[PDB]
Design a protein around this ligand. Structure first.
Ligand SMILES: NC(=O)c1ccc[n+]([C@@H]2O[C@H](COP(=O)([O-])OP(=O)(O)OC[C@H]3O[C@@H](n4cnc5c(N)ncnc54)[C@H](O)[C@@H]3O)[C@@H](O)[C@H]2O)c1
Ligand SMILES: NC(=O)c1ccc[n+]([C@@H]2O[C@H](COP(=O)([O-])OP(=O)(O)OC[C@H]3O[C@@H](n4cnc5c(N)ncnc54)[C@H](O)[C@@H]3O)[C@@H](O)[C@H]2O)c1
Ligand SMILES: NC(=O)c1ccc[n+]([C@@H]2O[C@H](COP(=O)([O-])OP(=O)(O)OC[C@H]3O[C@@H](n4cnc5c(N)ncnc54)[C@H](O)[C@@H]3O)[C@@H](O)[C@H]2O)c1
Ligand SMILES: NC(=O)c1ccc[n+]([C@@H]2O[C@H](COP(=O)([O-])OP(=O)(O)OC[C@H]3O[C@@H](n4cnc5c(N)ncnc54)[C@H](O)[C@@H]3O)[C@@H](O)[C@H]2O)c1
Lengths: 432, 431, 433, 432
């Protein structure tokens, strides 16, 4: 029983697979620290003034070496933390073990069941003689749990920092029922650059290579949707020598596709000739059963947008069709006449299963979360209110500024005359 | 000084030019199918029937297509030039011949300018109820000289940054008692004006002024907003090596992520072949920078005014200026070192490149739709302030231009529309 | 022993790890067939006429599913084949078994010793009642083995087809020793496009992702050498937002790097600031111990050129440095003060250990090899004498032509007057070799 | 005029008073031709062309002036004529005349003037040439025909033109080439500029000049995917055009595919394209029938050869109406009102509507100077009586001398590396 474990200090206030993995886990955390200089720089700069002294943070995020560097940064700034996984598969057990040995109440392991998942959140949140005043959440599951099961604890929370798209939607559904301030770091300016364009551009190629070993040259590709995600996928494939067609419902984005040098088509016009279909819409039923029926043999289908509904994968579970798992995250769906399509990640986000977020990008996110937590926790009366807010612009600039040394970038400082000219402070914020 | 037909109610150099100008218009019609499509879609239903529009814009074949689009939709119009030199006489003639009270010619004098404006406005038994202006000078004239008529105006559409500024200064004072629609902040218009145009114009302006080859040039672009982004991308695509300066760390981080060294100007000033300012700021390139530049360095401005580069600092008496080609000065130091200054530090594209007709169509169409939007507005909707073009109108501008590219827009199903929380006919995004 | 196995027909004329893997192998081969339509079209078009009837082919290549499709094409055109692996680690055991079960004498398994290697080559080549006519070799080891050990068999070989840079160099010695015609398919025109530029362009990003999970944006990269390989690496990294510096010894290539938008530097000018170093020179000691000492902490170093000597990896085996293997093909080399460098694939070619050749590219090579074998074997006497020849241009065009349907590309035909105007046959060749 | 300052009249130019203005243009050209200036400085007062007596027949531009003065600085004695009756810059010719160069050239020579100028250049009392530099083969022809004894004592001929080189080969096969010639038309550096770098720029520049177009979203078909086609496609693609490619050679067709273009037959796209560009070296690629099928306002131009890639002659018919609307731009109008925009009458667009950068002219002039040095100073037996290619090492030196323009720094092989590669440290580094 994994529940019967103690760390070297005699505590058992945690639940991890194997506490003896701690030393291996601490080595992986040390590695992440060396790859995240900007988070280490924020830590060192900010720790002396202990701006999270009295912070009692409950977190639900991915339990990786990089998340540990964030957690221990929060600790260095004076916080007390409890933590659970936001996903049943993503936990690095050795990291969970290292955190438990160092004294973090963490309730997390790889391969949790649904019941384990909620059990861990409750153990994270409901503990004798300690109540949270801050939430850090990736998905809103932990937030909702406190909401439904501990309404009076929920009312006392000073701040919710939320990282996910769906988590942010749920906070917006809260109908006058949101009674504490929330900070939407999903739409922070520096984050968005990375999360949308830069990451998807790389991860479309990485995931396609991982799943198919394909060559990109001369592939006919259709990308549905031309927002930032679509733009990024289009640019990546075009740079690798693919021929890319674009679909859109918004004429303004459509015109941009045209100006960017792509043919703008209805899916039907190209469905029968394409080698690759990629959904980037945030919409449902973009690729229908009939589209799938019209696809040529060996056409590859994937989703880079949301959920698993952009492609109607459910429509492929009819008795007539045969599925074969040929590789991790890769199914051949086969028709009676032998025609085959290649479906990736069962139509879930390709990058989540088949690529890895660079540590640098995890640093951008972690840094943003840390500053949002500091901001909500230390905020004066009246500033924030029963509503969803954005990170102050100066803090967003600070995230960028902390990461600039990675590139040996040299920022120019405005002179006094230029600052007056533009109506700005020398220290920012530079844009409204 | 007299047309076909009955009318002397116009004024232009020479009305025998009607046939030459009319061919010109007919070509511009072919190069502006979005405006022609707007007539096809809208002229039956006559959305501008009862609009009496006075216009003050550049008198070109492209502008003619717009004016006759306003006609086709119902409007009655009179027009003057917004600039004393820019008129195409032949086009003026041809609009006259078909019966536009047009008051404009090339090489006007200052008084003739206001004379022409006054002839648009005043005017027998015809009181204007709409203004389309590029400059704000027709609007100002009407404001000051005909205050009671001004209060009667249903709508003002102004194209210039400066005209818009003046409209916001009226509103601020409480004196804008008619609605204005700002046509410059629309998503479509900004894209062309800020990125797409600049991408092309920096390259065209540099070729025109210098005959340069781009490959292997060392370039520094000051500022990485939309305009700098565009110039960096264009030059990089032509094989130039581009360095970037910024004061905003978020923009600086983008420049890095896009593949550029992010530097202070002093780090590269002595080695670059080309310096381009895209900042909106003053004294970005100082006298000291100019002194430190190597022989034959090219300096130009893609930002604002003529002050990003401190050109005034180069007018000291020991420096020698030689005009070597239109818009190109060599500024020579006592020791014989030369820099090459383009367009006297003014916007290079304004004097060394040409706006494509397609982009003139985006502008013209936005202006037509704005006029239609104000004129047919319910009494509630617009009153005594500056409004932005509604998003649906910007979507239509874009939609009207898609046939240039053979682009095929997809339509949402009812299920998808409901899923996204949107109307099938848009608007598809906020703002 | 491994050596004590029979196929379902009682033959033990092969040596394979495990014959019961045959059925799984056969399914891998069938997958490869579907992904190599151009080789299957060549097969189907050329089969009936049996252009390789009487051909007795000894091959030494990578034993993958794709190679199987080539081998069975050769069989389908009438050849008799025996096969061995050209590398001790690359054999896919299940494919070797599928082959052995279909009746190919194949001598190959993953993880052979050096003695095993030469033993397999000997078994492939030296067998009572069957002399080879033709050699297909990737590296020259099989060719060398026959030359040295069976010099009378060698004199009787109708044709050598060689695939590899080092194999071709070896053939060129010749020296007066090459008494049979060889065809160099390493330098075929269609092949080269894919082997040099198109492969490296993809490989570099894939291999770096595989080994480091890096992002490319804002990485300062120095690429040594600006031939096709370096060119391909530069374009790929540039397109992903890296800042790329190039080194060259050839001023004509240097000038092209400049025109392509890259700063051209000496390595020491950027060695202290770069995040990634890539060697693409075909030269040795391009990155020396002293360069590695100068590198900043966490700099990534890899080779996309030849062998393992472009970076002087041997210089890092000094007792004050420690190595930690941190992932497959990833070592951290750590200095007394704690500075580290990240070395990939021990300075061997990154793409070979950390990427995969797309099957389409394996198709181009296989089709090329097949046609070279056909040409040599059916050649009039004495079109080919005692030298190294290139694949006929028309065959090279045919390789390209067979693969165009993958892209739905529609080739234009010269009219009769255009053919006359240009001085070209309607069916080519369109350009000289 | 008639005499220079020193009272010589051994020249023939329009007006000797133009010297000062010409000198100024030469000075500007010097600043844009550092490679030639560096050859001058490297001499260190030695005279590597001391005994050379060079007759030259080239375009009389400011760039040519710098070459001629470089040959003089190296110790050559030079006489010169124009290779073309229209191209002479009179001010430059005057400046050369003032400096003591016997130049016989002016703008608007008649055909009789042209040959007289050549005769004045090569036939002078008490001075025979021993070297020829020629762009066209006409000076060479004159000497061969009129002064056959002088011809036989020529030490070397350097020839710049395709046609001049063709003529030298005719003489050679006839057994009549009794002196060494060097073909500097074909060097690897020159090839790359003429075929790829210059065309990449000139197509875009030529299209802007003629039509004021925007490139974004244009549908373009490029016929031919050799070096010129490759360059045109990459330039238009980089500006956001959608580009289709035609080819007869499957190897080139496959490259187009792999580079991210659709590979089509012209007929598949002739009705939809906005721009047609011919880059084939072939005849009747764009036929009368293609022209009839083009959509209204389609722009048509040639980047290949001659004026026959497009069948322009088929449009010179009473049925069709031609209208010159701008320099090098015709609207060709059909009875039904459909219009085509023909550029440069289907001649080479770049030659009428663009400028060769001075850098490219420097590559050419530097090549010529080095070929002259090499031929003049070669030891007995190196160059027999035949056509030779520019040696590789000298092509490398040309390139190398131009690298400082880019602040580019060349690496040098160690002894151990040179040995490993089987190369001399100083080159040549590649075969040919
Ligand atoms: N894979 C990832 O890691 C990742 C990262 C960030 C965002 N996303 C998701 O990707 C989706 C798109 O993100 P974005 O930032 O590009 O959003 P966005 O709204 O800017 O763009 C989506 C585009 O799709 C278009 N669209 C909607 N329905 C369509 C249809 N049926 N056919 C064609 N086009 C249609 C819209 O007009 C819009 O332009 C969102 O759901 C977002 O959450 C994924
Ligand atoms: N040439 C044209 O036709 C054209 C077209 C549109 C806009 N503009 C003008 O171009 C300028 C830039 O426009 P934009 O849309 O890119 O604006 P914006 O988003 O860029 O603001 C300009 C950028 O320059 C940066 N900057 C300010 N001062 C700087 C300094 N001293 N050094 C380095 N960077 C500095 C700012 O941080 C900002 O990122 C504005 O003046 C705008 O009106 C010109
Ligand atoms: N990674 C792969 O799968 C792969 C594929 C094909 C070829 N290759 C190999 O890559 C190497 C390069 O191939 P290529 O086709 O580009 O060859 P190439 O000979 O055309 O290019 C190599 C370049 O390196 C330059 N060079 C030599 N020494 C140098 C040095 N010390 N510093 C800087 N530059 C130097 C040369 O001038 C040359 O231009 C060869 O060994 C080739 O066999 C590798
Ligand atoms: N505009 C210029 O300044 C300039 C510069 C250099 C060369 N050129 C000329 O451009 C032409 C092409 O030069 P290159 O260097 O690209 O030569 P190239 O031989 O490499 O390429 C021409 C290509 O056209 C293809 N082709 C031939 N006929 C065709 C047809 N009917 N349809 C489609 N494709 C066809 C050939 O397969 C070949 O690949 C030549 O005439 C050359 O002399 C012009």
């Amino acid at each position: 029983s994994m529940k019967q474990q103690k760390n070297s200090k005699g505590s058992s206030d945690f639940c991890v697979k194997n506490i003896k993995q701690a030393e291996f886990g601490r080595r992986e955390i040390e590695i992440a620290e060396q790859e995240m200089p900007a988070l280490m720089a924020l830590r060192k700069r900010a720790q002396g003034e202990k701006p999270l002294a009295g912070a009692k943070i409950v977190g639900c995020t991915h339990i990786t070496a990089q998340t540990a560097v964030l957690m221990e940064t929060l600790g260095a700034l004076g916080a007390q933390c409890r933590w659970a996984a936001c996903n049943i598969y993503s936990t690095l057990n050795e990291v969970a073990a290292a955190l438990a040995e160092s004294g973090f109440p963490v309730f997390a392991w790889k391969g949790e069941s649904e019941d384990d998942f909620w059990w861990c959140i409750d153990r994270c949140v409901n503990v004798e003689g300690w109540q949270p005043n801050m939430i850090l959440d990736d998905g809103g599951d932990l937030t909702h749990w406190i909401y439904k099961k501990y309404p009076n604890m929920f009312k006392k929370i000073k701040g919710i920092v939320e990282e996910s798209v769906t988590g942010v939607h749920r906070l917006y559904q809260l109908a006058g029922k949101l009674c504490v301030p929330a900070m939407n770091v999903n739409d922070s300016v520096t984050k968005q650059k990375f999360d949308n364009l830069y990451c998807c551009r790389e991860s479309i190629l990485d995931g396609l290579k991982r799943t198919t070993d394909m060559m990109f040259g001369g592939k006919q590709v259709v990308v549905c949707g031309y927002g930032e995600v679509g733009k990024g996928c289009c640019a990546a494939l075009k740079a690798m020598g693919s021929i890319v067609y674009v679909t859109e419902i918004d004429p303004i984005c459509a015109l941009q596709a045209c100006m960017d040098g792509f043919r703008l088509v209805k899916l039907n016009e190209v469905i029968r000739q394409v080698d690759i279909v990629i959904t980037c819409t945030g919409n449902k039923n973009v690729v229908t059963r009939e589209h799938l029926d019209r696809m040529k043999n060996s056409c590859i289908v994937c989703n880079m947008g949301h959920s698993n509904t952009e492609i109607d994968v459910a429509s492929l579970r009819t008795p007539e069709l045969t599925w074969e798992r040929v590789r991790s995250q890769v199914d051949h769906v086969i028709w009676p006449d032998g025609k085959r399509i290649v479906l990736l990640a069962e139509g879930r986000l390709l990058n989540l299963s088949c690529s890895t977020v660079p540590t640098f990008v995890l640093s951008i996110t972690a840094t943003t979360q840390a500053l949002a937590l500091i901001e909500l926790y230390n905020a004066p009366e009246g500033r924030y209110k029963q509503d969803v807010y954005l990170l102050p612009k100066k803090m967003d600039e600070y995230v960028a500024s902390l990461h600039l040394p990675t590139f040996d970038a040299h920022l120019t400082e405005l002179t006094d005359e230029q600052a007056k000219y533009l109506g700005l402070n020398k220290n920012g914020p530079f844009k409204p």
